[PDB]
Amino acid sequence: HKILHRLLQD
Amino acid sequence: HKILHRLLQD
């Protein structure tokens, strides 16, 4: 789930 | 829906 992980990371 | 009608009728 790369997109979500990246956006939640900041 | 014959069964339900019959049971609701009494």
Place this chain on the structure above:
Amino acid sequence: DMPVERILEAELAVEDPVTNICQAADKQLFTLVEWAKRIPHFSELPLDDQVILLRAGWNELLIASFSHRSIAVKDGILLATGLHVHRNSAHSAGVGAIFDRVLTELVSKMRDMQMDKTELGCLRAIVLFNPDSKGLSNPAEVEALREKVYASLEAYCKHKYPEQPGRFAKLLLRLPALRSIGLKCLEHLFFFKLIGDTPIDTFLMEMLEAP
């Protein structure tokens, strides 16, 4: 008026594995009609509307009842037929995931909060008086009955469990889990019918017909 005493009275008055599960469901459909007639004001609604409400709600109504019945059962459910179905037996019959949903989202939550029979009865009456049901001749009347049920349940919770101010909300918030689980069990039944190996009795078959 909608006294919780009448609702409680209604509950008390009606008191492979897939095959056994479908038998129980069919069996309980006859019992459900009897329950609904004992719920205040339901019998006074137009016959066509009583039909719509029971066709819309039957599955959720039946799931709620067997879930509460299963509160003393470790990792299993008790069918109305007297059969205990264990988690292991569900998994090895290809329906493990949905079975676990019932255990964790319904049975276990009812157990951890000690949901009582008056509370179960009210939640079911709320499910019964569903004003979103398609084809109703007067949704406003059904809504009014739903509002009366949840006014009475709230008053009952404030009085019986005054130390639990969140209890009423907690009860209502099991309804989305129930909806979702009802829809998944129905999906499975349609599939059992399609494959054609599982015996499906007449009242259960009639519920599976189009409106």
Place this chain on the structure above:
Amino acid sequence: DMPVERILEAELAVEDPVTNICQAADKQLFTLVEWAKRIPHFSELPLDDQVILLRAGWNELLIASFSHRSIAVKDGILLATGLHVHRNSAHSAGVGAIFDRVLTELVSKMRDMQMDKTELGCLRAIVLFNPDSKGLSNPAEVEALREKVYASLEAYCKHKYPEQPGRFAKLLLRLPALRSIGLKCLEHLFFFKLIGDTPIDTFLMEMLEAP
């Protein structure tokens, strides 16, 4: 603590037809992550749990928002892209029945009760903090946050609408409609993907992958 002021602030800070609908959904997925981070205590949860909650709730969260946005729209919805989609256009695109469900069970109910933005925000935060979500490392923590949200919402309803004692219950009882509609829209999306004619963008695609 869970002040409704922060929840309201979160809402305000993010303020053929099937193709246009799918564009909007994808678009709003980016916005949703931003909303969730502004909901008190969400960012402090383990990253894996934040992932589970957003994957479990995204659809219901997005449906709630476009439904409230559509309250001034006659027989239609307003997409986040600025497009108004009318009932007629939904029917003639083969998705009429589900479209009408949204209108009658969500948009119209939000309109008839004048659901405000604080209330919408709270219901969404409740949906976000779903302790039934599979794979959570601490469901009890998520449950605790859900309880705080609905304690605050109840207090907010008692105070802002004291003449409507059933309002809090009425709000919570839209959640089963939302669950059901979310599941039906998801079914449709999977079908659009299967047929392969409808463009489905990357964030929407990722939500459609297995866990």
